[PDB]
Amino acid sequence: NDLIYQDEHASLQPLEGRTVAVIGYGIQGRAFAANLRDSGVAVRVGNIDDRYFELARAEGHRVTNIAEAVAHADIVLLLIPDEAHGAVFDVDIAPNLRDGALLCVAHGHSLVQGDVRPLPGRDLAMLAPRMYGDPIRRYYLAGQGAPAYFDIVADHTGRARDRVLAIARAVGFTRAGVMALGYRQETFLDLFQEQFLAPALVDLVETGFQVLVERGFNPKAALLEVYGSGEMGKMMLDGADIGLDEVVALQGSPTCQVGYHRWRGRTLPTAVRELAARVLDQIEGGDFSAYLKEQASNDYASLDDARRAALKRPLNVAHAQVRAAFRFPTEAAGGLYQAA
Amino acid sequence: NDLIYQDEHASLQPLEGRTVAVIGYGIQGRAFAANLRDSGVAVRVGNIDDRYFELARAEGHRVTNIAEAVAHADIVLLLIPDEAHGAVFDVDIAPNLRDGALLCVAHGHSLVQGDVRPLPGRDLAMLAPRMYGDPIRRYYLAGQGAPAYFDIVADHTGRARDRVLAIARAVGFTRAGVMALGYRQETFLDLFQEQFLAPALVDLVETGFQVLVERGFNPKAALLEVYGSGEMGKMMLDGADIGLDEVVALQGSPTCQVGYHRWRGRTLPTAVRELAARVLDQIEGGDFSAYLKEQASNDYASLDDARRAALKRPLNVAHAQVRAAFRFPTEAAGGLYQAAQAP
Ligand SMILES: NC(=O)c1ccc[n+]([C@@H]2O[C@H](COP(=O)([O-])OP(=O)(O)OC[C@H]3O[C@@H](n4cnc5c(N)ncnc54)[C@H](O)[C@@H]3O)[C@@H](O)[C@H]2O)c1
Ligand SMILES: NC(=O)c1ccc[n+]([C@@H]2O[C@H](COP(=O)([O-])OP(=O)(O)OC[C@H]3O[C@@H](n4cnc5c(N)ncnc54)[C@H](O)[C@@H]3O)[C@@H](O)[C@H]2O)c1
Ligand SMILES: [Mg+2]
Ligand SMILES: [Mg+2]
Ligand SMILES: [Mg+2]
Ligand SMILES: [Mg+2]
C-alpha cells in the first residue's frame, strides 16, 4: 500500500550539526533556504553569478559559488533547472560531495536522463514538492505545508531515508504528507501536469473568453467570469479540500447546480483523452527530452519569445484591462523570505 | 466606456436610518447579512421555516417569516433560489414592499423570465456578486472584496443607484469593483460559467485523473497532481491576480515553461468551442429555462440523485482516499459569520 510520512513519522534529529547546501535560490531554492533557516537548520546557498546570488545575500544567507557550497555541506539540494543538472553535477557537485553526504533533486527528470547518477560512498534521493515556492513559504509560516513525493535512489550510509524526511519536516512537507513514489513515475506525472493539464485548463478558460467576446459579451465581464474574478480558482482550490463536485453541491445556487449537472461528464470529446495519452507517450518515449534539450540551448531564447507572444493574446490584453480597473485580493509579500 | 465603482465612488450615507431585509440566509444571504451588520447597517433576516432560519437566530440576527421582514424594511435583498422568486415575490414581497423601498436580486434570471417585475412607487435593481459566500465573507474581513455587476431596472425614487452602491460598499464589492451590466447579459454570462466552463474544467481534471489511472499511475498521486495538491487551484487563483500565462512565467521551472508552451493553444479540438456556442444557444433561447423549471418542480429530486451519483465517480472515491491520508491547509471557519468589526 502507500507509504505517507507526516510530522509523527519524521524528526530534525538527523540534521543536528549538519550543514545543508541549497544549490539555486529560485522558486524552490529560496523557499527551502528560508524554511530550513527558520527550522534552525545550518544552511549555505551555492549559486552562479546572477540576480539570485545577490537576492540570497540580501536575505542574509551565506552565499558562494556552487563548488564551495557543496564542499562545506553534509546535505546538497540541487534546486536549479533540470537541463543544468548534468554540467553542474559533473563539474561542481560530484568532485566536491563529501564521503557519506546526501544529494537531493526535487524532480526525477535528471535521474531518468542519467545526468545525475549514484556516487560511490554517497546517498542520492528525490524530494519533489507538489507546489511552487510562494505557497510552500506561506504555508510554512502558517504552521502548514504542501505535499511531496520522495524516493531513496542510493543509500550507501543507510541513513538517507531519515535525512531526506528530516529535510521534508524542516521545510514543512510532513504537515501535509510525504509519499514514497519512484523518481521515474514522478517525472512523467509532473511533466503530464505541465504539458496536458495546465495548458488544457488555460486553453478552456481562453475558449470561454473567445466565444463570449465573439458573441458580443462585455470583454471585461467575459474575462472576470472565466477566471479573472478568482471564482474558478477558488472553486479549484476549495475543491482540493472537499472535492470539485462537492464545492458545487455546497457553494452553488440550485440554478448553478442544475446547469452544472446538465453538462458534467458531457463537455469533452474522446480526442481530449487521446491527446493526453499522446502527451504521455512524448514524455515517456524521449520526444519531450529531445525538445527540452533543443529549447534549453541559446539560454531558452525560444521560451522568451513564447512568454512575450502570450502577453499579446486577447485573453492577456483583456486581463491587463480588468486588473487595472478591478482591485484583486493580495497579501503583502515584502520580507516573506526574511528570517522568522 | 465601462462604468466601474470602487470605494471612492460610493458611501454608506444612503443606508443611514434604513433597515435592509435579507430574504434568505444561504450561500449569498449569510454573507450579505454578516457584512451588512459588521458595516453598521440595520439588518433583519426573512426566511421560511428551515435550517437557515435557525442558523440566522444562532448567529444573532433578528429573524422572521419573509412577509414580516419585507414590511419593516427600506431595502429588500431577494437571496433565495431563482425558481422560488416568482411565488415569494407575488405572495410575500410585492404586497408588503413599502412605497419608495428598493428590491435587489443577485442574478438576472428572475428579471429575464418576468417572475420579478418593477412595482409602481418602488425601485428594482440587480447587484450580482462574481463570487460565492465564504470568499465574499473572508475578503470582507481582510478589508478586501469580490467584484460585482449592477443594473438599475426601475428607479421611482431617483436614489436607487446610490442605495444599490451603498449596499455594495457595505458588503465590500466596491473594494474590488462594481461594474454596470444589463441583467439580461449577466444572466447569460453567469449561466454560461455554470453550464460550459465549470463542468469542462472539472471534466478536464477528471480526464487527467482517468488517463493517469488507466495507464497504471498511483491513484493518490494522479489525484494530487490534477487538483488534490491545490497546485492547479493556486495557479488559477494566482492567475486571476497576475494572468494565467504570467503565473507559469514567474512560478514555473524552465522545464515546466517549455512543456506548457509546447501544448498551450493546441490541447482542445474545435468541438469544445462548438459546444460553448450550443450551451449559449440553450441559455439564450429558453431551452435551459424550461429544463430548470422541470428540475425545480419536484423540489430538485433529480439534482439530489445527481449529487449522490457524483460521489461514486472514481475521481471522488480517490479524493476521499487522498483527503484521509494527506492533511490540507485550511483556515478555521467556526467564527466566520459571527459579528466582527468593520475592517
Ligand atoms: N517551480 C516549481 O514549481 C517546481 C516544483 C517542484 C520542483 N521543482 C524543481 O526544482 C528545481 C529548480 O526549479 P525552480 O522552479 O526553482 O527553477 P528556477 O527557474 O527558479 O531556478 C533559478 C535558479 O537556478 C539557478 N540557475 C539557472 N540556470 C543555472 C545554470 N545553468 N547553472 C546553475 N544554476 C543555474 C539560478 O541562479 C537560480 O538560483 C528543478 O529541478 C525543478 O524541476 C520546481
Ligand atoms: N451561489 C452563488 O455563488 C451565487 C452567486 C451570485 C448570485 N447568486 C444568487 O443568489 C440567490 C440565492 O442563491 P444562493 O446560492 O444563496 O442559494 P441557496 O441554495 O444557498 O439558498 C438557500 C436559501 O434560500 C431559502 N429558500 C430555498 N427555497 C426557498 C423557497 N421556495 N422559498 C423561500 N425561501 C427559500 C432557504 O431557506 C435559504 O435561506 C439566487 O438568486 C442566486 O442566483 C448565487
Ligand atoms: Mg510540479
Ligand atoms: Mg449563478
Ligand atoms: Mg455567478
Ligand atoms: Mg516540474
Would you list the DSSP string of B259-304?
Answer: HHHHHTTTSS-THHHHHHHHHHHHHHHSHHHHHHHHHHTTTSHHHH
Q: Within 10 Å of residue B87's Cβ, how many Cβ atoms? A: 10
Radius of gyration from C-alpha coordinates of chain B: 22
Task: Tell me if A26 sits within 8 A of A52, measured CB to CB.
Answer: yes
Distance from the alpha carbon of residue A7 to the mean position of ligand 1, in angstroms:
27
Residue that has been written with the C-alpha cell 408588503 in this structure: B96
Angle at B35 between CA B29 and CA B40, to 5 degrees: 125
Residue whose Cα lies nearest atom 20 of ligand 2: it is B26
The answer to whether the beta carbons of residues A157 and A102 sit under 8 Å apart is yes
Q: How far is the CA of A244 from the centre of ligand 3 (A)?
A: 20
Cβ of A24 closer than 6 Å to ligand 1, yes or no, is yes
A232 lines ligand 1 (CB under 6 A): no
The rounded distance, in Å, linking the Cα atoms of A42 and B12 is 54
Cβ contact A176:B325 at 8 Å: no
Any ligand 1 atom below 6 A from CB of A110: no
User: Which residues of A form the catalytic set?
Assistant: 107
Resolution in A: 1.9
- Binding residue per annotation — A193? no
Q: Is A149 in the pocket of ligand 1 (CB under 6 A)?
A: no
C-alpha torsion sign, points B148, B154, B160, B161:
positive
Residues 6+ apart with CB under 8 A from A90: none
Q: Give the separation between CA B262 and CA A303, rounded to whole angstroms.
A: 10
Residues of B (150-179) whose Cβ lies below 8 Å from A = 175-177, 179
Q: Can you spell out the DSSP letters for B84-151? A: GHHHHIIIIITTT--TT-EEEESSSHHHHHTSS---TTSEEEEEEESS-HHHHHHHHHTT----EEEE
Find, in chain A, the residue whose alpha carbon is nearest to that of B311: A245
Which protein residues have their CB within 5 A of the ion that is ligand 4? A 256; B 190
10 Å CB burial of residue A208 (0-12, 13-18, 19+) is buried
Sign of torsion over alpha carbons A190, A305, A233, B205: negative
Closest partner CB to B276 (pick from A189, A208, A244) = A208
Please tell me the number of Cα atoms within 13 Å of A293 on its side-chain side: 11
Cell, residue A186: 514522478
Burial environment of residue B86 by CB neighbours within 10 A (0 to 12, 13 to 18, 19 or more)? middle
CB contact under 8 A, A251 and B307: no
A4-5 and A178-180: which strand pairing?
A: antiparallel
**All three cell numbers of A179:** 509519499
Residue A323 burial (10 A CB sphere; 0-12, 13-18, 19+): middle
Spatial separation of the C-alpha atoms in residues A26 and A33, rounded to whole Å: 10
A8 in helix, strand or coil? helix
Helix (H, G, I), strand (E, B) or coil at A222: helix
Strand order in the sheet with A148-154: A4-5, A178-180, A148-154, A123-129, A102-105, A75-78, A19-23, A42-46, A63-64
Instruction: Give Dmax over CA atoms of chain A in angstroms.
Output: 68
Pocket test for ligand 2, best of B80, B93, B105 (most atoms within 8 A of CB): B80
For residues B265 and B243, give the distance between their C-alpha atoms in angstroms, rounded to a whole number. Answer: 15
CB B227 within 8 A of CB B233: yes
B44 has which bridge partners?
A: B21
Q: How far, in Å, CA of A167 to CA of A133, rounded?
A: 15
Q: Name the experimental technique.
A: X-ray
Does residue A255 contact residue B107 with C-beta atoms inside 8 Å?
yes
β-pair partners for B64: B46
- How buried is B324 (Cβ within 10 angstroms: 0-12 exposed, 13-18 middle, 19+ buried)? exposed
Name the A residues in 215-234 with CB < 8 Å from any B CB: 215, 217-218, 220-222, 224-234
State if residue A132 touches ligand 1 by the CB under 6 angstroms criterion: yes
Q: Is residue A47 annotated as involved in ligand binding?
A: yes
Residues of A in contact with B280 (CB under 8 A): 211-212, 215
Which of B186, B196, B183 has its CA nearest to residue B282? B196
| C-beta atoms of A254 and B192 within 8 A | no
What count of other Cβ atoms lies within 10 Å of the Cβ of residue A58? 11
Planar angle of CA B250, B253, B258, nearest 5 degrees = 100
Longest CA–CA separation in chain B, Å: 67
A183 shares contact with chain B (CB less than 8 Å): no
Q: Cβ distance A131 to B326 under 8 Å?
A: no
Give the CA count within 13 Å in the CB-facing half-sphere of B269: 11
- B251: Cα within 13 Å, side-chain hemisphere: 25
Nearest CA distance, B23 vs chain A (angstrom): 15
How far A17 CA sits from the closest chain B CA (Å)?
30
Determine the residue type at B340: A
Residues written for chain A? 340
| Single-letter residue type at A169 | R
Residues 6+ apart with CB under 8 A from A246: A239, B311, B316
Active site residues of B: 107
Residue with cell 528530516: A166
* Cα distance between residue A150 and residue A181, in whole Å: 6
Look up residue A142 and give its three cell numbers. 502558517
Cβ–Cβ under 8 Å, residues B170 and B140 = no
Give the distance (Å) from ligand 4 centre to CA of residue B20: 22
**Residues belonging to chain B:** 343
Query: How many interface pairs between A and B have CB atoms less than 8 angstroms apart?
Result: 456
Q: Are B2 and B179 in contact (CB under 8 A)?
A: yes
- Ligand 1 pocket check for A26: Cβ under 6 Å: yes
**Choosing among B272, B274, B291, which should be mutated to test the A contact, i.e. which has the most A CBs within 10 A?**
B272
